[PDB]
Design a protein around this ligand. Sequence first.
Ligand SMILES: Cc1nc(Cc2ccc(-c3ccccc3)cc2)nc(C(=O)NCC(=O)O)c1O
Ligand SMILES: [Cl-]
Ligand SMILES: [Fe+2]
Length: 214
Amino acid sequence: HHHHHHLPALKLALEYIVPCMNKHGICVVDDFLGKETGQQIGDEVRALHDTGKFTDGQLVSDIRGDKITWIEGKEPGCETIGLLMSSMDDLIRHCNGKLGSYKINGRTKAMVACYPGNGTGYVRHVDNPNGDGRCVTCIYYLNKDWDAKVSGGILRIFPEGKAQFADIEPKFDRLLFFWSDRRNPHEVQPAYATRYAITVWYFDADERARAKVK
Ligand SMILES: Cc1nc(Cc2ccc(-c3ccccc3)cc2)nc(C(=O)NCC(=O)O)c1O
Ligand SMILES: [Cl-]
Ligand SMILES: [Fe+2]
């Protein structure tokens, strides 16, 4: 619909992501890339799944019934995942220096995750409990016409010492940010349909450096 227009990265970062993160430690951004790019992402992820590039989750870490694959972004057939990753980077670049006291200087590759339905989820956990440098978790969802009433698969976040929790449906073209540390324990509710997500973690220069030394 031609009546809608994309917020530039700078505008989205400063008018929404930065305040939202500093206040709530969680930020949801819908309609990040648009339908075409989102569908292409979905295609690429399904291809990775179909061509058997995923490793079982309970082998990497029971905790989980998921399976994952790491994507650098430049691999043949992963170009659109590459663009997603660069788009994530753009947002973060416009945030850097305003997300708490963090100084973002790098990130992980993208972890593509698949919950193959059939009741698979992920128990309550913290992404970075041992201060390994990862300060912000960034997740992109690409599940066309997801209905959590039927399929479940809600990400529930329990921000530390808050009287509220957050239910995030893994909606098509939804982007999510949250603090990676103990401030945000979270769980994936059982999924009853194939559930895909793509996650990167951004590093704090200081913590990352201290993680490697000590
Ligand atoms: C598979 C998987 N695993 C983890 C935990 C976790 C993963 C990776 C690292 C890590 C990363 C880079 C270097 C070292 C460790 C640490 C912890 N949380 C989720 C999750 O919250 N999902 C939410 C959702 O999908 O909506 C998940 O799906
Ligand atoms: Cl508010
Ligand atoms: Fe997690």
